[PDB]
């Protein structure tokens, strides 16, 4: 269905209920007392309420309390990615005011402080990490610089690699002096640094050395996994299809079903195409796919079958907006 | 509660705090030397226990589970519906009281409720001692249930019946009804179990539920596990429990198998199972691959599933199941047994109609099962002989009051999808058409519900055989004269089947003069060819409307012109009055601001395809796109996806 | 009286259990008759392609043979439930829709 178009009534009572839920969550996980039996029943209801709260309009103080409870006192066993998904859902109807941005900055500062011991690594099931949080802030305020994080940036040496990587992931939130100091310790070597740079915006245009990095990574993957008898390959195929890269060598690396489907569309076996991929593409990529001629008359058939059989409303919207 | 007996034949320990006797029994069963450390009496008792446990399908413990595959097998003649066999068995003299019990159940299943009640009373009188109290208890229960069913039949046969069924049709006499009411003046079944001897209450505790009004709430509530959307399974558990309930109710000859509660339970269980299977298939296709799973649903359908669906489902329920749980991707299992079951159904229908010994009580039960089975037989591949017998029974001997001509045509068309028409079936349909033609010779007219008549049979024959000629119909129309108008009309409806000489002789009895004659003739008869003079008649009508410048006439000729059934330039002289005519005549210059999308809901497959093939295509696509975006209409989306994409 | 009104959007019709006192064109008068529409998109046809719904007219419970269908004199509408006059609602609903027959009694889906 499309629930967001259903009128919601009695917003203040729902806000009071959610505030009570947040206060109970804070009580049960702050004062060193967690009722082990009651937790099993209560956590499911709390998670469902916080998930469903995206359609309700909330005031400033209630939203602040809910965000604080969700970010800080919610048990980890909700990972970071699920927490980000919940927060993004919350922000849709109740566009981020300044206080919630301050709370998010506090959470990011706490996470950065946690990144000292060289055994602490974020474990996100979906794949969304703390870095995305920063992007969310930059999605609502372009001129925001975290004053507290700059202090951590300045007092950093080359010894602690984890802090360097973590602050590199959140580069745009830092000030000019902070960026200048941080760039003196890190380069664009290898693959993860290149991906973080292109995502953040350091590398506006790809350079040949990054092409060599990509080529050698593909060679290693070929000789290590398939020859010897994952999202990186899909991202590289996406980059090539968007004409961002200008090399024909990668065409010889045909394996990843998505890789085959992208670099070699004419000879790709469309029987291996799955429709779920179509839910992970943005507007420009979908338009470019619609512009192609070797891909239209099979994607359109897959979409027709999905509309006829499935109960999902995204496929029909995709078909009507772009391919027709 | 010392053990849990799972539906797959395994036993686990639940609350046994003492000695594990069942484990020791299984150990004795597996070994042979350990079996022999018992006395003769204990040895024969162990043999009897082993036979009973093997008969009831208890295999081993959970730890020692090996190659666990379960298949059901019901050994009752009443379930398979071998009516003649039970009729013969009733006649033979009984030996014991169990044979009398079985005869009473068979009589009840055959609609002879008075005889069954009398036999149950006789069994009650004879069997009161001393260890067979189970027979006495079951006889009491069955007698009460038959009394209830007789009262309800009386209730829905004094009213909502009589001539509306065909005749007053008093099922039973009034003396029998008075005696029935007197004998059960204040009978109470709730205290029936508590009045039995205490040894019966201690031993046969498990039968107590038979004395309750409802006994299937546990399974109906448990059916909720098939609606979970969270990614042995519940499907197997539910199916095996259903088979267990059916086998227990049918093998012990209990009359509760004919009440509404049991039918509703069966319907809910089967519908939910098929819904879950289809949803799982869709999810797997969505995530895993387009065809990696194979697109074949995992719900294998066997003989018993077909029998249950035929017996316990109405037509509307089967229609809902087809709509929501697409069946063409569900493959059926054993086909020979299903074909034999359908052949038996057809033979029973033939016997019931021909012998004129219609049993009004048995008719209501049997006809629904027959209709459901013949409706559901579309997905089963049938051999030539079985198909011929089924078609004969359906077309000729099926009562008219329950299947009019249109529904019969619908059933027949369904039966031809997976089998196609061989020569014998065409001969049978030709014989049926000849019989109908003879019947039309009068104060007679066909009555149909869906609006389909005898013309459609000839249309289907021509669809499957372009070069078929009905010799008997040709002989019938060769002797025809001008006195009997309805026969000429009927033969007109079957015009293409007749021979050329018969056609020429038939044309003499009707000719067209005015535009009404032309439209009527093409409407019901066949004037497929558009002669120039008929065209001139249409031109005269159009000129009359032009100078004169409200139902539909002009759009028909516009569509005919667009389909190239008429070829002339005069049509361009009649542009301006009816917008649909202008759209169908002049598409390039048509003002699409006057176009309304509802027109697209009145065209068939061929016209829509021809429109899609004409370039007009882009404006129609834009209109359909806007209509789909504004209001989520399924018909518009279906048309746009099927024809314009 | 409006509670039992149903709208069928697959053929753009209305299901309402009413009786029509239609007056056929050229002074022919008909008593309380009604209509029945059937929806069949798979019927085998020849040159009469312009159809997915077949409309039958039932008068006094018997099918009326059609010779020239031009009745446009409306009808004194009678709700057979308790004999209500609903003619104005009928005439409004008819002008609101471009379909030939806007109101029927029963629709049969042969899909």
Curated annotation (Swiss-Prot), chain C:
Keywords: Host-virus interaction, Inhibition of host innate immune response by virus, Viral immunoevasion. GO terms for biological process: symbiont-mediated suppression of host innate immune response. Counteracts the defense-associated sirtuin 2 (DSR2) defense system of the host. Inhibits the NADase activity of host DSR2 by competing with the tail tube protein that normally activates DSR2. Interacts with Bacillus subtilis DSR2 (via C-terminus) in a 2:4 ratio; this interaction leads to the absence of activation of the NADase defense activity of DSR2. Belongs to the DSR anti-defense 1 family. This is SPbeta prophage-derived DSR anti-defense 1. It comes from Bacillus subtilis (strain 168).
């Amino acid at each position: 269905c499309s629930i967001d178009k259903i009128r919601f009534g009695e917003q203040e009572k729902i806000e009071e209920y959610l505030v009570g839920i947040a206060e109970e969550i804070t009580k049960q996980f702050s004062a060193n007392g967690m009722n082990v039996v009651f937790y099993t029943q209560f956590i499911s209801e709390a998670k469902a309420a916080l998930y469903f709260a995206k359609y309700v309009k909330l005031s400033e103080e209630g939203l602040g309390k809910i965000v604080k409870a969700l970010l800080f006192y919610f048990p980890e066993r909700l990972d970071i990615g699920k927490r980000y998904v919940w927060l993004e859902r919350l922000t849709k109807c109740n566009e981020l005011p300044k206080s919630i941005i301050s709370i998010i900055d506090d959470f990011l500062v706490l996470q950065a402080e946690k990144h000292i011991d060289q055994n602490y690594s974020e474990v996100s099931s979906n794949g969304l990490y703390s870095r995305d949080y920063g992007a969310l802030i930059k999605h609502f305020e372009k001129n925001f610089i975290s004053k507290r994080l700059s202090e951590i940036t300045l007092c950093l040496t080359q010894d602690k690699q984890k802090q360097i990587d973590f602050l590199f992931k959140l580069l745009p939130l830092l000030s000019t002096n902070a960026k200048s100091h941080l760039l003196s310790f890190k380069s664009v070597e290898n693959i993860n640094d290149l991906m973080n740079g292109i995502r953040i915006g350091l590398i506006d245009e790809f350079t040949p050395e990054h092409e060599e990095l990509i080529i050698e990574y593909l060679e290693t993957r070929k000789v290590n996994y398939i020859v010897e008898k994952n999202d990186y390959m899909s991202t590289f195929g996406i980059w090539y299809f968007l004409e961002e890269i200008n090399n024909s060598k990668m065409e010889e690396f045909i394996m990843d079903d998505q890789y085959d489907f992208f670099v070699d569309p004419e000879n790709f076996d469309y029987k291996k195409f799955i429709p779920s991929w179509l839910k992970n593409y943005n507007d420009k990529l979908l338009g470019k796919i619609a512009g192609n001629k070797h891909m239209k008359h099979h994607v359109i058939e897959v979409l027709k079958e999905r509309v006829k059989n499935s109960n999902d409303k995204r496929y029909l919207e995709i078909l009507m907006n772009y391919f027709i | 509660y010392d053990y849990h007996f799972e539906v797959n034949g395994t036993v686990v320990r639940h609350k046994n705090k003492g000695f594990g006797y069942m484990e020791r029994f299984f150990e004795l069963k597996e070994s042979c030397d350990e079996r022999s450390k018992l006395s003769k009496k204990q040895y024969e008792r162990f043999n009897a226990l082993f036979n009973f446990f093997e008969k009831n399908g208890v295999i081993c413990m959970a730890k020692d589970a090996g190659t666990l595959n379960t298949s059901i097998e019901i050994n009752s003649l009443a379930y398979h519906g071998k009516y003649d066999v039970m009729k013969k068995f009733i006649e033979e003299q009984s030996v014991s009281i169990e044979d009398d019990y079985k005869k009473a159940f068979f009589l009840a299943c055959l609609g002879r409720w008075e005889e069954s009640y009398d036999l149950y009373s006789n069994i009650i009188l004879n069997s009161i001692d001393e260890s067979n109290g189970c027979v006495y208890y079951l006889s009491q229960i069955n007698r009460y249930r038959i009394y209830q069913s007789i009262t309800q039949a009386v209730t829905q046969f004094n009213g909502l019946g009589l001539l509306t069924f065909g005749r007053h049709y008093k099922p039973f006499t009034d003396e029998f009804l008075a005696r029935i009411e007197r004998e059960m003046t204040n009978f109470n079944i709730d205290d029936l179990f508590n009045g039995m001897p205490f040894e019966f209450q201690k031993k046969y505790k498990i039968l107590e539920f038979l004395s309750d009004n409802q006994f299937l709430y546990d399974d109906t509530v448990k059916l909720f596990e098939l609606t979970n959307k969270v990614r042995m399974s519940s499907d197997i558990v539910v199916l095996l429990r259903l088979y267990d309930n059916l086998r227990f109710l049918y093998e012990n000859c209990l009359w509760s198998v004919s009440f509404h509660e049991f039918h509703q339970y069966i319907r809910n269980s089967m519908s939910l199972l098929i819904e879950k299977a289809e949803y799982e298939r869709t999810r797997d296709i969505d995530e895993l691959g387009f065809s990696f799973f194979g697109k074949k649903s995992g719900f294998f359908m066997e003989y018993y599933d077909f029998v249950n669906i035929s017996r316990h489902f109405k037509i509307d329920d089967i229609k809902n199941l087809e709509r929501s749980c697409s069946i063409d991707k569900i493959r059926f299992g054993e086909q020979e047994k299903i074909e034999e079951y359908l052949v038996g159904i057809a033979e029973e229908i033939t016997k019931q109609f021909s012998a004129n010994g219609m049993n009004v009580v048995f008719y209501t039960q049997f006809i629904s099962e027959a209709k459901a089975a013949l409706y559901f037989a579309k997905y089963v591949k049938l051999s030539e002989e079985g198909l011929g017998k089924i078609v004969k029974a359906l077309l000729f001997y099926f009562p008219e009051r329950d299947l009019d001509i249109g529904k019969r045509y619908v059933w027949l068309e369904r039966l031809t999808k997976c089998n196609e028409l061989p020569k014998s079936i065409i001969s049978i349909i030709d014989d049926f058409l000849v019989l109908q033609a003879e019947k039309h010779i009068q104060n007679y007219s066909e009555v149909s519900s869906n609006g389909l008549y005898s013309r459609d049979y000839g249309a289907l024959i021509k669809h499957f055989e372009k070069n078929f000629i009905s010799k008997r119909l040709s002989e019938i129309t060769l002797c025809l004269t001008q006195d009997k108008q309805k026969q000429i009309d009927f033969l007109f409806k079957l015009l293409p089947l007749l021979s050329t000489n018969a056609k020429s002789h038939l044309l003499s009895f009707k000719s067209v003069e005015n535009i009404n004659d032309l439209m009527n003739g093409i409407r019901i008869g066949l004037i497929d060819e558009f002669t120039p003079e008929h065209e001139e008649l249409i031109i005269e009508y159009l000129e009359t409307r032009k100078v004169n410048y409200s139902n539909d006439y002009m759009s028909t000729f516009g569509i005919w012109y667009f389909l190239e059934e008429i070829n002339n330039s005069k049509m361009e002289e009649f542009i301006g009055m009816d917008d649909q005519y202008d759209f169908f005549v002049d598409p390039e210059n048509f003002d699409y601001k006057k176009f309304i999308p509802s027109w697209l809901k009145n065209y068939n497959d061929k016209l829509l395809g021809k429109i899609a093939g004409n370039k007009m295509k882009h404006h129609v696509i834009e209109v359909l796109k806007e209509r789909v975006k504004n209001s989520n209409d399924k018909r518009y989306l279906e048309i746009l996806m099927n024809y314009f994409i | 009286a409006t509670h039992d009104l149903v709208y069928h959007s697959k053929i753009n019709t209305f299901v309402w259990d009413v009786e029509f006192d239609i007056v056929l064109s050229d002074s022919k008068e008909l008593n309380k008759c009604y209509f029945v529409k059937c929806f069949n998109p798979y019927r085998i046809n020849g040159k009469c392609d312009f159809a997915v719904s077949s409309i039958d007219i039932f008068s006094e419970g018997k099918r009326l043979l059609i010779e020239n269908e031009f009745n446009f004199k409306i009808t004194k509408a009678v709700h057979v439930a308790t004999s209500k006059d609903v003619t104005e609602i009928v005439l409004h609903l008819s002008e609101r829709i471009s379909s030939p027959f806007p109101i029927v009694k029963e629709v049969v889906y042969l899909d």
